[PDB]
Design a binder for this molecule. Structure first.
Ligand SMILES: [Cl-]
Ligand SMILES: [Cl-]
Ligand SMILES: [Zn+2]
Ligand SMILES: [Zn+2]
Ligand SMILES: [Zn+2]
Ligand SMILES: [Zn+2]
Ligand SMILES: [Zn+2]
Ligand SMILES: [Zn+2]
Ligand SMILES: [Zn+2]
Lengths: 167, 168
């Protein structure tokens, strides 16, 4: 039974994540986050609040073959440049896509799953994904940046998806 | 162990008239691949052959929570129905768009099962709606076809966002 991904609204998506002090204690959760990620059709990033957990942990795999896990423990965006709009979705706001401003160049510091420091500097699509996933750990969803109308539309779409039966 | 790709609208393959099966033993592979494709979806409960680019008049359904209640309908036809009501539908080939569509809430369907034995299903349960939606695919019809041309255009827009998206 892989962990289920929560959908908005759910108060667990809005909790501030807590720093991990004991990396050895969160190995199960890391493996479970990866299993949940990989059980999705097209998921490329998953943050712990999306499965209802408060630990500051993100997992990402941007590879075509889905065999390139990136685990970020206690991630932070340390700097960034080159703001651009780009379309995002989120497994926790299913079926709704919209353009969001992000830094297209970023530096993130985190620990890897073994607890070793990691510094990732990137101007690729990874930059966008990390910012999106790290935002979850602050209790933020990408729709939060959108006009009120768009936010309303997003919530209505999620509800349709959640309530629908016939596919 | 890939499953078959579910095609998304617009695609001419979704608009073909399906062909009657006359040799049931010859489409057993397809039936199994249809079911595997369906079971690989997050929450699909019905898939019709045109949605994988196949011409055969075959639909597979599984309404169960456990996904161990496959219903295979070969050469299905709606024979009768009554008590039309609006109800929300979606479709694996029109992802991320949902709308209200009219269907009979009571229906009679005739088909063959995967062994080629006659099947007559008379139901007032949600299966009625699912059967009508899936049978519609074999006539080259999508649920959005009952909607205004403007809602159809919006549906296509939402499908395209889904198809093109990367960040999730
Ligand atoms: Cl929420
Ligand atoms: Cl089409
Ligand atoms: Zn994500
Ligand atoms: Zn997300
Ligand atoms: Zn979807
Ligand atoms: Zn949906
Ligand atoms: Zn279906
Ligand atoms: Zn359909
Ligand atoms: Zn989608």
């Amino acid at each position: 039974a892989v962990l289920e991904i929560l959908t908005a609204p759910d108060p667990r998506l809005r909790v501030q994540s807590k720093q991990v002090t004991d990396v050895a204690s969160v190995q199960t959760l890391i493996d479970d986050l990866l299993d949940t990620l990989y059980a999705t059709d097209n998921g490329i990033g998953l943050a712990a609040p999306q499965v209802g957990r408060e630990e500051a942990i993100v997992v990402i795999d941007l590879s075509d073959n889905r065999d390139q896990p990136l685990v970020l423990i206690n991630p932070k965006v340390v700097s960034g440049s080159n703001k651009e709009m780009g379309q995002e979705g989120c497994l926790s706001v299913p079926d709704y896509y919209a353009d969001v401003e992000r830094y297209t160049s970023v530096v993130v510091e985190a620990l890897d799953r073994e607890g070793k420091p990691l510094r990732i500097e990137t101007s690729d699509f990874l930059a966008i994904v990390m910012q999106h996933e790290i935002d979850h750990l602050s209790g933020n969803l990408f729709i939060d940046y959108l006009s009120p109308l768009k936010q309303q539309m997003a919530m209505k779409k999620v509800k349709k998806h959640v309530k629908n039966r016939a596919r």
